[PDB]
Nucleic acid binder design. Sequence first.
RNA 1: CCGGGCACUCUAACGGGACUGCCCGCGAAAGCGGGAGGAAGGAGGGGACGACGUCUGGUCAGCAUGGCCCUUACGGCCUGGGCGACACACGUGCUACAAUGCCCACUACAAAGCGAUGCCACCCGGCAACGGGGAGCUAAUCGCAAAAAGGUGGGCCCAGUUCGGAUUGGGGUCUGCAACCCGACCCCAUGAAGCCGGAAUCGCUAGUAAUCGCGGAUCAGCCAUGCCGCGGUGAAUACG
Lengths: 97, 60, 116, 97, 206, 83, 23, 155, 127
Amino acid sequence: TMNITSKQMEITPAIRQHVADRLAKLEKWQTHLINPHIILSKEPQGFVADATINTPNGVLVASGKHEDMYTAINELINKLERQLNKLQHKGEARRAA
Amino acid sequence: ARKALIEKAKRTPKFKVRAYTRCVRCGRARSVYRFFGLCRICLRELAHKGQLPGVRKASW
Amino acid sequence: ARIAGVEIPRNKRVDVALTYIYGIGKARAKEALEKTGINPATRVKDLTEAEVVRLREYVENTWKLEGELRAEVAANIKRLMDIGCYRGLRHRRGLPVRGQRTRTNARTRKGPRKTV
Amino acid sequence: IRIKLRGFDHKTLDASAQKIVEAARRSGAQVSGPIPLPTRVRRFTVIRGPFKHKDSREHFELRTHNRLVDIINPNRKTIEQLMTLDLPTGVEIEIKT
Amino acid sequence: GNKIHPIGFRLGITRDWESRWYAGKKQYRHLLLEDQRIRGLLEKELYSAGLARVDIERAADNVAVTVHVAKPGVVIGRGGERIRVLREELAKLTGKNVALNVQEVQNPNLSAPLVAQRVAEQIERRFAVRRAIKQAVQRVMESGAKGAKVIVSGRIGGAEQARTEWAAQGRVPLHTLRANIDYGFALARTTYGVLGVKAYIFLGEV
Amino acid sequence: PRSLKKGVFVDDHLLEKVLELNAKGEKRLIKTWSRRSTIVPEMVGHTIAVYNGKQHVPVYITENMVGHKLGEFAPTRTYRGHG
Amino acid sequence: GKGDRRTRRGKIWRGTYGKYRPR
Amino acid sequence: ARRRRAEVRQLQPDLVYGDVLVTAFINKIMRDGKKNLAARIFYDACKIIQEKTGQEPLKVFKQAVENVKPRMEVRSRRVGGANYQVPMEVSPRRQQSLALRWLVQAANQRPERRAAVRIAHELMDAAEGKGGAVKKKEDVERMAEANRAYAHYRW
Amino acid sequence: EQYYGTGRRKEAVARVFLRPGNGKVTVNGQDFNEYFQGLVRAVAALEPLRAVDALGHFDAYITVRGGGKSGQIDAIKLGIARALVQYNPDYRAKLKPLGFLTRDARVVERKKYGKHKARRAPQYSKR
RNA sequence: CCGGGCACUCUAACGGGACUGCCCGCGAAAGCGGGAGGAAGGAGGGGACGACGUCUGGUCAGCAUGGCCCUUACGGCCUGGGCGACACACGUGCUACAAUGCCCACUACAAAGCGAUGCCACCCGGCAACGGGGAGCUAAUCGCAAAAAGGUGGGCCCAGUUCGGAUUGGGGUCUGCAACCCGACCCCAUGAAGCCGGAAUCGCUAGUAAUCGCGGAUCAGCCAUGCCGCGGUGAAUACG
Ligand SMILES: [Mg+2]
Ligand SMILES: [Mg+2]
Ligand SMILES: [Mg+2]
Ligand SMILES: [Mg+2]
Ligand SMILES: [Mg+2]
Ligand SMILES: [Mg+2]
Ligand SMILES: [Mg+2]
Ligand SMILES: [Mg+2]
Ligand SMILES: [Mg+2]
Ligand SMILES: [Mg+2]
Ligand SMILES: [Mg+2]
Ligand SMILES: [Mg+2]
Ligand SMILES: [Mg+2]
Ligand SMILES: [Mg+2]
Ligand SMILES: [Mg+2]
Ligand SMILES: [Mg+2]
Ligand SMILES: [Mg+2]
Ligand SMILES: [Mg+2]
Ligand SMILES: [Mg+2]
Ligand SMILES: [Mg+2]
Ligand SMILES: [Mg+2]
Ligand SMILES: [Mg+2]
Ligand SMILES: [Mg+2]
Ligand SMILES: [Mg+2]
Ligand SMILES: [Mg+2]
Ligand SMILES: [Mg+2]
Ligand SMILES: [Mg+2]
Ligand SMILES: [Mg+2]
Ligand SMILES: [Mg+2]
Ligand SMILES: [Mg+2]
Ligand SMILES: [Mg+2]
Ligand SMILES: [Mg+2]
Ligand SMILES: [Mg+2]
Ligand SMILES: [Mg+2]
Ligand SMILES: [Zn+2]
């Protein structure tokens, strides 16, 4: 199941749940999101949201950076979406010749 | 809590169980070798200088 | 219901069969078969009513067993729980008693996995 | 009549066992030549870096070598020049009878 | 960070210990503590001398401490004057028979640990660090070395972004065991923090 | 547990305080930091206040609670369940 | 059985002795 | 692997028949590097196949090996958007291995209680074309025959 | 009167003493089959002598120290192979092509830090 | 074991030794295919060793250190507690689910290390942990010591069991000022889940993998099933 780490930060069950809510955007692709891991951290210049997820066709590893934590969590999701979609459709790329 | 502690290790204790090794060089409480009075790290430093009699890098 | 309240497995060696009584392990097993001079190798289905009653008689009389053994364990825990000691507390929650780590595991006391 | 040679340096062990077994073979008389006893080994295995990194180590060893020579026919023209013989620093000597 | 200490790496092949004395398990630690304490006063007082090595021999409560250096005079004192004042503070720590000798260095510019101390001092004196390095390397090479390499790391010139500078001439085979490579390290304090100077000298392959 | 050969352990400094209470004819609350101490037959009927690390906890001592230690009845962890 | 103290095999593993593995 | 071909290890002949093959088959009986036990079981089996069928262990075993040698097999190769099962001839090295592996495997699916018996039996049945091991070969051989159409897709 | 090879394998060492006689054999103070009982690996130790038809021509007394029973068997296999070549030097042809003269250096490879054994790495999960 | 001897095993220092050196073949050449000799053959197996650099990688809690911050307190001493919590989730592992196995007994073969309030033979008490006696050894002597899988013989008979050993009751031993929280061990009793594991996913190419025991560092004791080493027995497979 889904695990979130807050590194050198205190975050609420609210913020935690909001992460589950943004991550669910990945269920769109209808494949097994296996032991997804979200990490939240506050660098000098803004927050960082890292995630590492394995699916039947591979791994999603990506990282968001923004002055705003919520905005970084989103940028994380985009990077994850793009990778996941690249995983799911790259195989179709060469059915001919 | 450090120098007070690098000190409380030297002082003879109210009960013998409280005896514990500190590295005689750096004060580190953990990973302290009986034979040298050294922690694992210091041991590496001196040994690299050659300030440990007979002690050399083993390879087999 | 041969000994004592329980019908110990026929087809088995008496040393083993007796182990199928609540309160009798390998140890107490070898012990009774000596104190009543019977061969452990004898299949229960091969005991003289004589050999049998010897076994029965001893065993019921020397050691607390079945229901009475359980009652005591219940009674022991019963009291530990009521006096309010720390071992009593662990019983009062169904948790482990012998200092085990409970951050993970602990499943035999807890029961299989409970949703969140 | 036993001389026992122990040190941390094996080149200086054969040094002393040369210059000792040479002394008595001169001024009388029977030397039981330098015997190489098995070495006692003290290993030091240590995490290289100061923090975490458990899987990288550096192996150190301490060779305390062992030698023994016997002076069989004693002949005390030796037992004097032996009260005066030049020890390299890195070695201890043991004589008892 | 990755590279091994070129000294510990050559012990018993190209280089030999700074402390030669046998001991058993009951004594080793206790003697070595003294030898630490010993180098404490001596590396302290003799910095001014231009201290390069502190050799130490031992038998039983009497100890031969061979100091090597660039300026024997600072170590001597007047006609044996200071050399003694140490043996008193010395044998007070030693608590025992402390034979304190002085050994010359044929060239502080072929001695690694020295060259390092120099440049460290040059940079504590606000000298242009890149200058210092190329210079120190040119000095070591003029003095006949088969190769030289010096390294400074830290807030060079007072930067915020720490930086690492180094230079080299000729050969410096850190991978080769038969290469004689004296290594020396000095720590340069400044008002803005600690830089670290590492010195490498390749004397020759044996 | 502590060997049958060696003594039954009470901190001496609690026992004195108990015994003094026996003579003058008991009984008041006894503050103590001695969880290590055995409850002992002469302790029966007091109420001793045991420290857990934060609180000195009232324990009326009974005949059935005799071999057990002092800390067994002044719990160290607050736990009212999860969620 | 390596986890069964009450056997020979158990006591070799735990590195101990007793009725079930004597010295 | 990537650089050059692999070299088959030469096995040491077995001291009850000097036979390179009995060796290999022993090994495939061996769990946990317990070769002695692995020999016992095998040899015991031979005793059995001697007893229950008055003819040579060696002669029997060697047959049940020839009868479990797959001559063709399918190996997969994705072409386009389908994973085709391609028919391929099997090199004798692999033929042997498959035969040995399968014999042991089939045997260890048998219900008789002792390891020595099962081996003895699987070998008996396979010398006569019966049993799981031979059934594996046929399944494998039918599978390749069925996919005869994709033969020109072979590497 | 006597023929000798030093035989080694792994940690096993074998001082082998060939003598002529009837073909009875002994290892470390007891009869061979009594010391190697139930070890099918055995008769391979006496294998080098079969390669030159010297079964019954020789007795043998043997010490064997270190390793385990099979390594010792291996050592013995080397020693009795060894001694034949001094008993008879022209014996190389029909001992070397059968690999009997040679000593395999295959030794228990060293356990390394960061691993669980010599080569067995510890399991990890990327994600 | 004593005379006796260093042959041999060994121990531990010094050398030798392989070099594509020779042979045929291919090649302009470097080298490549191969044969002989030889313990070893094309880097003999393993090790120590890690380029300029990268991740604004890791560590200000080992240490050092700029700077910033606290100064009857953000310093210091203590008693007790905590770090060992437990609806849950993830990583690493141990022990299994059994007959190639389990138990009892009888009997073999290692290596590396460790050992003066230290390792402890042998004798005695106790079912035992252990207790009391008590010889040796600064240790190639004396001890930890039994190696285990293995071998011979006996039981179990396919059962949630003579599998498995979790949990729990009761009774002891030891260390330690002190084992409630919270040690380890022993013994009686208890005897869980577990019948080979979805999605997914790890290791290893040879003395490797798998299996088996033994030591060590730390250490009063120990939660070590962790870690660093050591030998025993010893595979499969590499088209590509
Ligand atoms: Mg990252
Ligand atoms: Mg798949
Ligand atoms: Mg400090
Ligand atoms: Mg302690
Ligand atoms: Mg410590
Ligand atoms: Mg029962
Ligand atoms: Mg707990
Ligand atoms: Mg690890
Ligand atoms: Mg069991
Ligand atoms: Mg099959
Ligand atoms: Mg050797
Ligand atoms: Mg091994
Ligand atoms: Mg890791
Ligand atoms: Mg000789
Ligand atoms: Mg950073
Ligand atoms: Mg600091
Ligand atoms: Mg700071
Ligand atoms: Mg300022
Ligand atoms: Mg912790
Ligand atoms: Mg899980
Ligand atoms: Mg584990
Ligand atoms: Mg120890
Ligand atoms: Mg059951
Ligand atoms: Mg069930
Ligand atoms: Mg059972
Ligand atoms: Mg079953
Ligand atoms: Mg499996
Ligand atoms: Mg299994
Ligand atoms: Mg599994
Ligand atoms: Mg490889
Ligand atoms: Mg097992
Ligand atoms: Mg162990
Ligand atoms: Mg310990
Ligand atoms: Mg515990
Ligand atoms: Zn230190």
